[PDB]
């Protein structure tokens, strides 16, 4: 399965910038966004593991420049069950 | 009834990582996610007591590595009334 | 009229553990759960005064072990008007 | 027009107790409740001015015993326009 | 186009008192209320510039007496684009 | 493709003042407003790079005269994927 990269920010503008930086940094698809309240929002990308790492590294740094980064994480081999509960599928 | 395992984080990325660690660690069913404002989000799994303990321990440790773990708990025998009111059923 | 027991937590996992402990401690019916944002959620039970007291005492202890208790309270004889505006009826 | 009394708490349980104490303290009708996020919720009563003062005074003190009071206020002659935008009408 | 007056509070009671003071102070139309999480809520009125200024000054002072005033502002000639996007229209 | 300007505030009144200042500073179109909780709201404009820069500079100054600015940013050339996941299109 494709790897999963995620960036979480507090603020949508930082996430939109994170998302742009991600999809331009590597061969990843922006497959989902989720807001959970408290000002926290998450963007989800899929690609190969090396792609997700380069994508999320660019996006994290991009987000830090304009807003508040909360988390950045790659799961190389995300479990199939995750797709049913979170917006990570294509 | 099956046991109930729950992890609650502040931040969705910590929760996706916890949920991944959970379903990988033991044979549990990821049976829902719930947000309640303030950035708090909870994931629920059902399995036998041994599986829910193994799942939640794995998820807790994993969430803690990348974000804010709020709560982790197993209810070995959740009361039938809970399924009516909370999204712990299948 | 039935008494009303209720617990409010900051965190859903503490509320679910509290609710389980309530319906197991006394003969009370778990009638509603409400979320009002900022992470705050409330579980409401109905039964006789002694039952709601036993239940909410047990629920409060259960909750604060694993999460944050905001409020615990019994109203022995709730006014009819509460039922039209709050989710406390059957 | 009837006077308007309002209590705002951070926490629902405090508000439910405030509401019970209000309707038992004076000849007021509990006409509405509104949650606005951040944990803030508001209960609205209508009656004569003296009723709303006694109602809100009892409710305020009731709420302070079990939770966090945010505001308590009586408008003796609330403008007609308020009814269209807020849950204060009968 | 008509001028736009807005008051924003943290807390609904402060906002209801502000709105009351507004419609009583000048000939303005209360054209909506908006909540955005965190306890923040905004009331909007439309009238001529003189009326919106009179309204918002009255509301701001009144809200301050009983709660947390966050913002108060008049836009004499709000751009047509704003009505499309925000609930300032009738 | 059009550039994307955006401002995020904690407070709706500051965002409406910022948005007014944006559409009045340059040839941009106010295309979306998003709220994500915790009081955070975002306005999004489209136009050429120079226009979004002028707009967002003006909006950021206007926002901070009356409220709290969280983020201001221009993406000169946003990726197509942003449009499928965020409200930035026409």
From Swiss-Prot, chains A, B, C, D, E, F:
Pathway: Amine and polyamine degradation; ethanolamine degradation. GO terms for biological process: ethanolamine catabolic process; protein hexamerization. Disulfide bonds: none annotated. GO terms for molecular function: identical protein binding; structural molecule activity. The keyword DNA repair does not apply. Keywords: Bacterial microcompartment. GO terms for cellular component: ethanolamine degradation polyhedral organelle. Residues 3-87 form the BMC domain. CDD domains: BMC_CcmK_like. The keyword Repeat does not apply. InterPro entries: Bact_microcomp_CS, BMC_dom, BMC_shell, CcmK-like_sf, CcmK/CsoS1_BMC. Pfam families: BMC (PF00936). SUPFAM superfamilies: CcmK-like (SSF143414). It is found in: Bacterial microcompartment. Probably a major component of the bacterial microcompartment (BMC) shell dedicated to ethanolamine degradation. Each homohexamer has a central pore with an opening of up to 8.6 Angstroms. A positively-charged funnel leads to the pore from each side of the hexamer; a phosphate or sulfate ion is found in the pore. The pore probably allows metabolite passage into and out of the BMC. Homohexamer with a central pore of up to 8.6 Angstroms diameter. The hexamers pack into a two-dimensional array. Interacts with EutQ. PANTHER family: BACTERIAL MICROCOMPARTMENT SHELL PROTEIN EUTM, PROPANEDIOL UTILIZATION PROTEIN PDUA. Belongs to the bacterial microcompartments protein family. This is Bacterial microcompartment shell protein EutM. The gene is eutM.
